[PDB]
Scaffold this active site. Structure first.
Site, PDB file in Angstrom:
ATOM      1  N   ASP B  80       0.814  -1.208   0.000  1.00  0.00           N
ATOM      2  CA  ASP B  80       0.000   0.000   0.000  1.00  0.00           C
ATOM      3  C   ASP B  80       0.853   1.266   0.000  1.00  0.00           C
ATOM      4  O   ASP B  80       0.385   2.323  -0.443  1.00  0.00           O
ATOM      5  CB  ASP B  80      -0.866   0.045   1.256  1.00  0.00           C
ATOM      6  CG  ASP B  80      -2.011  -0.931   1.254  1.00  0.00           C
ATOM      7  OD1 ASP B  80      -2.518  -1.315   0.181  1.00  0.00           O
ATOM      8  OD2 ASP B  80      -2.432  -1.259   2.380  1.00  0.00           O
ATOM      9  N   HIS B 122      -3.377   6.823   8.965  1.00  0.00           N
ATOM     10  CA  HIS B 122      -2.965   5.466   9.337  1.00  0.00           C
ATOM     11  C   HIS B 122      -1.511   5.356   9.770  1.00  0.00           C
ATOM     12  O   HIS B 122      -1.142   4.371  10.396  1.00  0.00           O
ATOM     13  CB  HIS B 122      -3.177   4.482   8.183  1.00  0.00           C
ATOM     14  CG  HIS B 122      -4.607   4.336   7.765  1.00  0.00           C
ATOM     15  ND1 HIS B 122      -5.602   3.920   8.618  1.00  0.00           N
ATOM     16  CD2 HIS B 122      -5.207   4.518   6.566  1.00  0.00           C
ATOM     17  CE1 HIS B 122      -6.754   3.871   7.968  1.00  0.00           C
ATOM     18  NE2 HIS B 122      -6.543   4.232   6.718  1.00  0.00           N
ATOM     19  N   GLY B 130      -1.452   1.961   4.878  1.00  0.00           N
ATOM     20  CA  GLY B 130      -2.684   2.456   4.306  1.00  0.00           C
ATOM     21  C   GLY B 130      -2.543   3.711   3.474  1.00  0.00           C
ATOM     22  O   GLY B 130      -3.346   4.641   3.595  1.00  0.00           O
ATOM     23  N   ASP B 157     -13.478   9.716   7.901  1.00  0.00           N
ATOM     24  CA  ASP B 157     -13.070   8.850   6.802  1.00  0.00           C
ATOM     25  C   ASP B 157     -13.792   7.515   6.931  1.00  0.00           C
ATOM     26  O   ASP B 157     -14.184   7.110   8.020  1.00  0.00           O
ATOM     27  CB  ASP B 157     -11.552   8.620   6.945  1.00  0.00           C
ATOM     28  CG  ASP B 157     -10.899   8.065   5.720  1.00  0.00           C
ATOM     29  OD1 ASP B 157     -10.253   8.864   4.998  1.00  0.00           O
ATOM     30  OD2 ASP B 157     -10.957   6.825   5.515  1.00  0.00           O
ATOM     31  N   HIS B 159     -12.419   4.739   6.851  1.00  0.00           N
ATOM     32  CA  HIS B 159     -11.538   3.827   7.555  1.00  0.00           C
ATOM     33  C   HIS B 159     -11.251   4.322   8.974  1.00  0.00           C
ATOM     34  O   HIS B 159     -11.216   5.529   9.245  1.00  0.00           O
ATOM     35  CB  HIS B 159     -10.220   3.669   6.786  1.00  0.00           C
ATOM     36  CG  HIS B 159     -10.390   3.101   5.412  1.00  0.00           C
ATOM     37  ND1 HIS B 159     -10.616   3.884   4.293  1.00  0.00           N
ATOM     38  CD2 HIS B 159     -10.323   1.825   4.978  1.00  0.00           C
ATOM     39  CE1 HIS B 159     -10.717   3.091   3.238  1.00  0.00           C
ATOM     40  NE2 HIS B 159     -10.534   1.842   3.626  1.00  0.00           N
ATOM     41  N   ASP B 246     -14.273   9.063   1.176  1.00  0.00           N
ATOM     42  CA  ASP B 246     -14.492   7.696   0.734  1.00  0.00           C
ATOM     43  C   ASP B 246     -15.746   7.059   1.324  1.00  0.00           C
ATOM     44  O   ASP B 246     -16.024   5.895   1.015  1.00  0.00           O
ATOM     45  CB  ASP B 246     -13.238   6.820   0.884  1.00  0.00           C
ATOM     46  CG  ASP B 246     -12.596   6.852   2.260  1.00  0.00           C
ATOM     47  OD1 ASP B 246     -13.042   7.609   3.146  1.00  0.00           O
ATOM     48  OD2 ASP B 246     -11.612   6.060   2.416  1.00  0.00           O
ATOM     49  N   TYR B 285     -11.719   8.476  -3.421  1.00  0.00           N
ATOM     50  CA  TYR B 285     -11.101   7.811  -4.553  1.00  0.00           C
ATOM     51  C   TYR B 285     -11.962   7.891  -5.814  1.00  0.00           C
ATOM     52  O   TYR B 285     -11.532   7.429  -6.867  1.00  0.00           O
ATOM     53  CB  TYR B 285     -10.739   6.350  -4.180  1.00  0.00           C
ATOM     54  CG  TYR B 285      -9.920   6.331  -2.914  1.00  0.00           C
ATOM     55  CD1 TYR B 285     -10.480   6.002  -1.694  1.00  0.00           C
ATOM     56  CD2 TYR B 285      -8.594   6.716  -2.933  1.00  0.00           C
ATOM     57  CE1 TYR B 285      -9.760   6.056  -0.533  1.00  0.00           C
ATOM     58  CE2 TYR B 285      -7.859   6.762  -1.779  1.00  0.00           C
ATOM     59  CZ  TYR B 285      -8.435   6.436  -0.580  1.00  0.00           C
ATOM     60  OH  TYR B 285      -7.661   6.529   0.554  1.00  0.00           O
TER      61      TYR B 285
HETATM   62  K     K Z   1     -12.998   7.278  10.418  1.00  0.00           K
HETATM   63 ZN    ZN Z   2     -10.336   5.894   3.902  1.00  0.00          ZN
END
Ligand code: K
Ligand code: ZN
Ligand code: K
EC number: 3.5.1.98
Lengths: 4, 353
Positions: B80, B122, B130, B157, B159, B246, B285
């Site tokens: 990544d 990340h 990430g 986000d 993630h 995202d 993205y």
């Molecule tokens: K988050």
């Molecule tokens: Zn993300």
């Protein structure tokens, strides 16, 4: 991607 | 008093070079400019971070390795986070931009400072992860701590904001709150509701695990409930807000079913507190939708309603076939069971009193  | 907008031509060109998001920085900036929003902000050129500044979080050895790879071609690199030429200068630019935003806030130049190209949440002290080689969010929080006693970090986000959470896991002076997808095999795998932090930091990490298909109304109800409780319990003096796009319908992550309106309501709820607030991007993205989202959120920051019609500008064709600013949710199931959300919210509510 891989991975995240 | 006007918001600071972190921008320079060299910074946008650098940020345009990250391979997962080619030209995204230029798209975001050019849509903001097409709506004339830069005329309502104070443009501040970002400085480049020094290794000394990066070392307030990242280890000396990680920074030596990052420099070595950046010149020549371990520590989370390769997949990544490919080990490619120039990665150190890219890291230094992104870290420097978020530090510059934080400095504007501590200097009282503004109450909101925007770095849409930051949010690389990340990265860990000694590990890229990430797509994130440097944790600019952590660096900005540390800079804010020079003047603000308690920092609230909110991460919207898709993630989990694991790198930021981990950086502050053991302290009560920074509270991290992440809303994210949580599902077996979904990156980075952490951030269940039972993840609350450690030691004196126990209950100063908040995690809201969410399933595919969440839409604006429920997401805002969740976010508002949590943030009201967090504000009352923690009394933050400054906020760092990561707004990775995202989550927005149409993203290749193909998980949540949000529009910028729902994120905007979360943003407005935070802005009502009138605290020094550092605004970051992150994931996102679908490039045109990410530009739509962050342009709309810039309008929210400025109190401005934008025309639905995308103004003609260099990237116009990316906005077809509709050429409007609003995003239509997809037709997919909301996999969030009401009583499971109740369980999550009730757990958090109890932990914060
Ligand atoms: K988050
Ligand atoms: Zn993300
Ligand atoms: K914490």
């Amino acid at each position: 991607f891989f991975x995240x | 008093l006007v918001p600071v907008y972190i921008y320079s031509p060299e910074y946008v060109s650098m940020c345009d070079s990250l391979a997962k998001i080619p030209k995204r920085a230029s798209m975001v900036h050019s849509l903001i400019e097409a709506y004339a929003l830069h005329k309502q902000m104070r443009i501040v050129k970002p400085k480049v971070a020094s290794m000394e500044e990066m070392a307030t979080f990242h280890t000396d050895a990680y920074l030596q390795h990052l420099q070595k790879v950046s010149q020549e071609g371990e520590y989370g690199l390769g997949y990544d986070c490919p080990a490619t030429e120039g990665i150190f200068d890219y890291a230094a630019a992104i870290g420097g931009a978020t530090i510059t935003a934080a400095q504007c806030l501590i200097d009282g130049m503004c109450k909101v400072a925007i770095n849409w190209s930051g949010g690389w949440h990340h990265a860990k002290k000694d590990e890229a992860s990430g797509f994130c080689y440097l944790n600019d969010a952590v660096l900005g929080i540390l800079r804010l701590r020079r003047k603000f006693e308690r920092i609230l970090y909110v991460d919207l986000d898709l993630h989990h904001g694991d790198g930021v959470e981990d950086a502050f896991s053991f302290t009560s002076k920074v509270m991290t709150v992440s809303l994210h997808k949580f599902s077996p095999g979904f990156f980075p795998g952490t951030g269940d509701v039972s993840d609350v932090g450690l030691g004196k930091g126990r209950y100063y990490s908040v995690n809201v695990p969410i399933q595919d298909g969440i839409q604006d109304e429920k997401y805002y109800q969740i976010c508002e409930s949590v943030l009201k409780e967090v504000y009352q319990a923690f009394n933050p003096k400054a906020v760092v807000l990561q707004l990775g796009a995202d989550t927005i319908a149409g993203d290749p992550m193909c998980s949540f079913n949000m529009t910028p309106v729902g994120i905007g309501k979360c943003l407005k709820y935070i802005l009502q507190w009138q605290l020094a607030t550092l605004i970051l991007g992150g994931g996102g993205y679908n490039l045109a939708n990410t530009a739509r989202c962050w342009t709309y959120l810039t309008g929210v920051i400025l109190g401005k309603t934008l025309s639905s019609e995308i103004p003609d500008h260099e990237f116009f064709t990316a906005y077809g076939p509709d050429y409007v600013l609003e995003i239509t949710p997809s037709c997919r199931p909301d996999r969030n069971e009401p009583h499971r959300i109740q369980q999550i919210l009730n757990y958090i509510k109890g932990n914060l009193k």
